[PDB]
Design a protein around this ligand. Structure first.
Ligand code: NI
Length: 497
């Protein structure tokens, strides 16, 4: 051996076929999309010399670099790009191509993309869908023996065991200091055990584990979009959805409750106690992103402010020391998913933090199936996070209300809907950004704390790794909520010795 062994996620089952989407994170190892995001969130082109949307944002012009090749040496041209997009759309998978219509090849280095309607977020598709070879693609065969333009290529794959890959010599981006990589697939505990023993060069660890010194290893803290928040029902009770699930909560429908909970919680204390300080306070679902409203942050852990907000809206302390309004006491149930000690620790901590302002929080846990039934009538603990601004839409659009796990509190604000649609219809993502910011607050209304306060956002989680002292994991964009997020920086990895 003498090569780098890594433990950063679990088995890449199902396979490595870009036609099945970017839902998994391992694909970034063997494949490369047309675009690669920068740390300043602009876009670099690995395979493109030129890419330009039209004034209406309905068409894209793509120009390839001339001598590109696949991992097997076969040439990468317009034919393969157009094939990739047309067939990814034309199958499932059900890759969400959005408003994508079709891809036309102009010449071997040029491709024209056609859309149904303006989509400012389509760039996120360009930096996501991996390129596939038109000549050599077979649906069943490709998952097991894939051909890609990624930084590495498959050498061997041992199920439930390990994966061996080597550097792709035809890679169009930067080569790193590591010629060969072996990825080990282990449960967290055995992984940590192998890490201390110095068998591994890089290992992902949970931010919640009071990590002590590890022999001949160093701790890396990488930024992430992964977050934690509480979603409130915004409507009164009494109605039910298509599944017969109850909709609404007579307590959390009052905006004063949601604002008060937003101010009472001390997020820094959450980060330090539960996440061992490896988290950042989050006041929005898009904290740390360009499309976050710059005026969205608040000074929290203010019991007095919370009590003021509650008093001004008619929520008064009863004899039991619990808030009450028009004969209705503030007693609410917080739901969360079982199977995680940390989620529960977070929940109980929240109950304890809401006790001083007179809100009595009962806690219930269950399987996703169980949570689903109660998810619309009670406050609920969720984890999300995405590098696509589209998530704002999924959270706050009236059209997304009750759609799967999105917008379960049935939040509807027509002005917010307008800002959202304006944002989607913008010809470029840059022009879209100011409208995305208007969602929190436009000066009059919004979905944020200054406005309707649909959420109580708690934290943005950061990912933590142990790495051999001679290993430099470099730098990159915030890591996704998923496995193999570290791979987003893989090209900048260096060897310090
Ligand atoms: Ni055409």
């Amino acid at each position: 051996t003498h090569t780098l062994q890594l433990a950063i996620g679990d088995e890449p089952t199902e396979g490595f076929d870009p036609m099945l989407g970017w839902s998994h994170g391992s694909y970034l190892l063997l494949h490369s999309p047309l675009l690669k995001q920068n740390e300043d969130f602009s876009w670099d082109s690995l395979l493109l010399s030129q890419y330009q949307p039209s004034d209406d944002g309905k068409t894209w012009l793509l120009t390839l670099k001339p001598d590109l090749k696949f991992s097997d040496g076969s040439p990468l041209t317009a034919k393969d790009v157009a094939f990739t997009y047309n067939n990814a759309a034309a199958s499932g998978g059900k890759v969400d191509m959005g408003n994508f219509l079709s891809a036309e090849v102009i010449d071997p280095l040029n491709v024209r993309i056609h859309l149904k309607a303006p989509q400012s977020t389509f760039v996120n598709v360009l930096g996501s869908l991996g390129i596939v070879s038109a000549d050599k693609y077979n649906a069943k065969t490709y998952a097991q023996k894939p051909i890609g333009a990624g930084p590495y290529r498959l050498v061997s794959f041992q199920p439930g065991q390990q994966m061996i890959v080597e550097a792709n010599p035809y890679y169009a981006g930067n080569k790193n200091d590591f010629d060969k990589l072996i990825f080990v697939f282990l449960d967290e505990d055995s992984a940590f055990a192998a890490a201390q023993s110095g068998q591994l060069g890089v290992v992902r660890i949970p931010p919640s584990m009071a990590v002590g010194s590890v022999n001949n290893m160093k701790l890396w803290v990488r930024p992430s979009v992964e977050n934690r928040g509480i979603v409130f029902p915004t409507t009164p009770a009494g109605k039910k959805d298509a599944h017969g699930y109850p909709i609404g909560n007579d307590v959390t429908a009052d905006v004063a409750i949601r604002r008060a909970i937003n101010y009472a919680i001390n997020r820094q204390l959450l980060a330090d106690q539960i996440m061992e300080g490896h988290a950042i306070p989050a006041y929005t679902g898009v904290q740390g992103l360009p499309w976050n409203n710059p005026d969205s942050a608040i000074k929290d852990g203010d019991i007095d402010k919370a009590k003021q907000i509650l008093e001004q809206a008619g929520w008064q302390l009863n004899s039991q020391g619990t808030r009450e309004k028009n004969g209705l006491p503030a007693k609410i149930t917080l739901w969360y998913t079982s199977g995680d000690t940390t989620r529960r620790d977070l929940a109980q901590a929240l109950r304890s933090m809401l006790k001083p302002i007179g809100i009595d929080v009962d806690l219930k846990s269950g399987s996703w199936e169980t949570v689903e039934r109660n998810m619309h009538a009670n406050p609920t603990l969720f984890g999300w996070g995405s590098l696509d601004p589209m998530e704002l839409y999924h959270h706050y659009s009236s059209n997304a209300a009750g759609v799967e796990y999105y917008n379960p509190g049935y939040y509807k604000n027509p002005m917010v809907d307008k800002h959202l649609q304006q944002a989607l219809d913008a010809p470029t993502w840059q022009q879209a950004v100011p409208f995305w910011q208007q969602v929190d607050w436009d000066g009059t209304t919004g979905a944020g704390i200054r406005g309707d306060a649909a959420w109580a956002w708690l934290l943005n989680i950061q990912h933590t790794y142990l790495a051999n002292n001679c290993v430099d994991l470099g730098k990159g964009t915030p890591e996704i909520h998923g496995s193999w997020s570290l791979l987003n920086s893989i090209d900048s990895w260096k060897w310090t010795c």
